[PDB]
Amino acid sequence: LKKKYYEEPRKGIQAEEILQTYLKSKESMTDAILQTDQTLTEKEKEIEVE
Amino acid sequence: KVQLPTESLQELLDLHRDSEREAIEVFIRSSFKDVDHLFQKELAAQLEKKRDDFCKQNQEASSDRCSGLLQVIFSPLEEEVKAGIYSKPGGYRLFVQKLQDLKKKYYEEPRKGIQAEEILQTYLKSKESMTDAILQTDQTLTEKEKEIEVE
């Protein structure tokens, strides 16, 4: 989706700054998905070990 | 008389109206034979343009101050999420309680100005995905603990 955003024309001078501000706003969502993945992966590993 | 951000739009408008009236009185005392009131219309247009500038600058100053304040107040909570403090059974409930306590703290802070609610709502909406990720992690861990206890 970042690659798709780069391909779009007529973004103007704030293209990078707005994208970086947006990506930074989604770091918490990324981290929450990571914690959920790790917790589920550990639970699957325990289920397989059991 | 104007110090930004102003708490209400109304206080800023009243200060503008008083200063505008005094400026019109200064003009009336130093003008004569204003054909078609052309100079008076020019003055009114200049005063309207200044009203719009100062209202915009107040919106910006209020937004920036509130955005910085939310970063200060909720920066520990964001770091606590990154460190996985809420990644445990019942951790979502603790995150929601801490989020409510920090909103209460943000409300107590003075000199937020007219964008206080709008900036806070925009910030809270940006953290819904983080809230949901913590909830999914809590549910998954709580189910795993329940299976471990059942086993």
Residue numbers in the entry:
A (entry chain B): 443 to 492
B (entry chain A): 342 to 492
Question: From the publication, what sentences describe this entry?
Answer:
Guanylate-binding proteins (GBPs) are interferon-inducible, dynamin-related GTPases that mediate cell-autonomous immunity against a wide range of microbial pathogens. Host defense against intracellular bacterial pathogens such as Shigella and Salmonella is orchestrated by human GBP1 (GBP1), a cytosolic lipopolysaccharide (LPS) immune sensor and surfactant. Upon GTP binding and hydrolysis, auto-inhibited GBP1 monomers dimerize and assemble into soluble and membrane-bound oligomers, which are crucial for innate immune responses.
Here, by applying cryo-electron tomography (cryo-ET) and subtomogram averaging (StA) on GBP1-coated liposomes and single particle analysis (SPA) on self-polymerized GBP1, we report an outstretched, dimeric conformation of GBP1 oligomerized on a lipid surface and in its polymeric state in solution. The GDP•AlFx-bound GBP1 coatomer was well recognizable in cryo-ET volumes of BPL liposomes. The protein coat had an average height of 28.3 nm ± 1.6 nm, which agrees well with the theoretical dimension of a dimeric, outstretched GBP1 dimer (~28.8 nm). Although the map did not allow for a detailed molecular fitting of the GBP1 dimer, it suggested the potential oligomerization interfaces: the MD and GED were apparently not involved in higher order assembly, based on the absence of density between these elements outside the dimer. In contrast, the dimeric LG domains displayed lateral contacts mediating the formation of a two-dimensional protein lattice. Within the coatomer, the overall shapes of the LG domain and MD match well with the recently published crystal structure of the GBP5 dimer and the cryo-EM structure of the GBP1 dimer, suggesting that the coatomer is comprised of dimeric building blocks with crisscrossed MDs that are extended by elongated GEDs. The GEDs extend in parallel toward the membrane surface, allowing the C-terminal farnesyl moiety to insert into the lipid bilayer. We show that the peripheral helix α4’ in the LG domain is critical for establishing the oligomeric interface and facilitates the formation of an antimicrobial protein coat. The farnesyl moiety can insert into the membrane, while helix α4’ is available to form a stable oligomeric interface via the LG domains.
